[PDB]
Amino acid sequence: RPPQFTRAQWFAIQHISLNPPRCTIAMRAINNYRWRCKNQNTFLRTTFANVVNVCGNQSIRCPHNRTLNNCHRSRFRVPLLHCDLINPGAQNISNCRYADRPGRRFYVVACDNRDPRDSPRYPVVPVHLDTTI
Amino acid sequence: RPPQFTRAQWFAIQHISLNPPRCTIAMRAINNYRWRCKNQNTFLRTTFANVVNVCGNQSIRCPHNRTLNNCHRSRFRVPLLHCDLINPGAQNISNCRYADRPGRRFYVVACDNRDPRDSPRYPVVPVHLDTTI
Amino acid sequence: RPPQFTRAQWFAIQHISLNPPRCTIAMRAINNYRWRCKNQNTFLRTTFANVVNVCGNQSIRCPHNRTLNNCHRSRFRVPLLHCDLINPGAQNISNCRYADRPGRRFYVVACDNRDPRDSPRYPVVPVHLDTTI
Amino acid sequence: RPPQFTRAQWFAIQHISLNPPRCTIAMRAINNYRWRCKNQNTFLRTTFANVVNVCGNQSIRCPHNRTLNNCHRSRFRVPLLHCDLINPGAQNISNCRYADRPGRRFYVVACDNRDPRDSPRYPVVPVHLDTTI
Numbered sequence: 001r002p003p004q005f006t007r008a009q010w011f012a013i014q015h016i017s018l019n020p021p022r023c024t025i026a027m028r029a030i031n032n033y034r035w036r037c038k039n040q041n042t043f044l045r046t047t048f049a050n051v052v053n054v055c056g057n058q059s060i061r062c063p064h065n066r067t068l069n070n071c072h073r074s075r076f077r078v079p080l081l082h083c084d085l086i087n088p089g090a091q092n093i094s095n096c097r098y099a100d101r102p103g104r105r106f107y108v109v110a111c112d113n114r115d116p117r118d119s120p121r122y123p124v125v126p127v128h129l130d131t132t133i
Numbered sequence: 134r135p136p137q138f139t140r141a142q143w144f145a146i147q148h149i150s151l152n153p154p155r156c157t158i159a160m161r162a163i164n165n166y167r168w169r170c171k172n173q174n175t176f177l178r179t180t181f182a183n184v185v186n187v188c189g190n191q192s193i194r195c196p197h198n199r200t201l202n203n204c205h206r207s208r209f210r211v212p213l214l215h216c217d218l219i220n221p222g223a224q225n226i227s228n229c230r231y232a233d234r235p236g237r238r239f240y241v242v243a244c245d246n247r248d249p250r251d252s253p254r255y256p257v258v259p260v261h262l263d264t265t266i
Numbered sequence: 267r268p269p270q271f272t273r274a275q276w277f278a279i280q281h282i283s284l285n286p287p288r289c290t291i292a293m294r295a296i297n298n299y300r301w302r303c304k305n306q307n308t309f310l311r312t313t314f315a316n317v318v319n320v321c322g323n324q325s326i327r328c329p330h331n332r333t334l335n336n337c338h339r340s341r342f343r344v345p346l347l348h349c350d351l352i353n354p355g356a357q358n359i360s361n362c363r364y365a366d367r368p369g370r371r372f373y374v375v376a377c378d379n380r381d382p383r384d385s386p387r388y389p390v391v392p393v394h395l396d397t398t399i
Numbered sequence: 400r401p402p403q404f405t406r407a408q409w410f411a412i413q414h415i416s417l418n419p420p421r422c423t424i425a426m427r428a429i430n431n432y433r434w435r436c437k438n439q440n441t442f443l444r445t446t447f448a449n450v451v452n453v454c455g456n457q458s459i460r461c462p463h464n465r466t467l468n469n470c471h472r473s474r475f476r477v478p479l480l481h482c483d484l485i486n487p488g489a490q491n492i493s494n495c496r497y498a499d500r501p502g503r504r505f506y507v508v509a510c511d512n513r514d515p516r517d518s519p520r521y522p523v524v525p526v527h528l529d530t531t532i
Contacts, residue, residue: 009151009180018142019162029152047142048181049252056382119182121254121389123379189322191341208324246522249455253386256520275417275446284408285428295418313408314447315518385448387520 023083023098055111156216156231170229188244289349289364303362321377422482422497454510
């Protein structure tokens, strides 16, 4: 996570976009902050407030990150854009290209207490997109 | 406003971006929904929650839409990216180009009651960026 | 606070009454839920919505609960009924009597995020009447 | 309706009480404004905001007042207190006594555009309790 952002803000940068450009473009926003291009990434076509509400759902074991049990599954499916790296052959991150996979899925997020810099309007915030179902 | 979006969602698409790309790229997201390229546009580098807070500030006359008095001035400045159309003689919206002007200003928003499709976390939402100061 | 009520509901019961009966009658509603009769209490003659508006005013130090800084001062005065216990030597709560002091004052409230059981129309609600001015 | 109150405020005075006293006491608040004691009255043990939400439900023919079709049925039942006059024998309104009937029912309200004095937070407000079901 870039220090410029709280965990919730970085979550939103990586995973919330109401109307993302195609993945090869959308992924630049994330990969600029990285050593190497991200292998895969999902953008949920929803709002931050909608995801905060999912933090209020039943807490579950995080499917990917199974040392954690601060995960929460959405009650409903949301439209999304999945991005898959097609050229892991490195050189520079500006050269990374992605396959586009639009879809509609439930999502599972890890939620934590907010950063002091996050709005007091959300005591608990999403901090990681664990997986989609 | 495109029918796909509520007024609050369209406000966010046009005016909220924590880390926007340069204006010529950033403005495509907006201009795709327009007949002609937008002459100017400001992206506030803040969160939706922070803008909603402004809605609770003292109501004032809207500076640029003076038939309205449901405007609200922010209490603090925010970093932002202002975009200015530089080729209004553009053939197609795909070819519109913008000058970039990063800044830090107070802003004024018009706010209204939320749309049924908006998150219940905000009964009162920004619906227009009236101006910046 | 009685468990039957959210903090916002209990705030309303204690402090919001458009047309309260005289204090000796009005205070029974509160004192029924208490071990001992309340020494003083103000009923604001306003609406819940108007008090919620105050929550969006500038945050200040709570005058009477100075460990808190989630207080907010109203921008205008409201009519009110202040009640003062006149027989603290009362046998039972049924026998407590109050002096009536109608007035018109600014008020200061502490506000917090709503309870899951509160109406979604107000994500931020008054939870305590800190003082009047 | 007493001129001191908007239609929505008068609705709330007559029909919204989270914790009403027994009917003989509760009804004084209404009957003080009347020539003769009200024959019957229901207090809904809910909040104004909850009732405003019911104004968003399907519009129906008003069961009692059948010249109107701006009525709305609650989706769920609410606890309430019904009050029935037991001594229509007049003399003074201070002497009126009521039978208490606690219950839990759906309710039907007539809703209209708000008074300019009502909060802009509710464009539409309840103005009459038409019946309970």
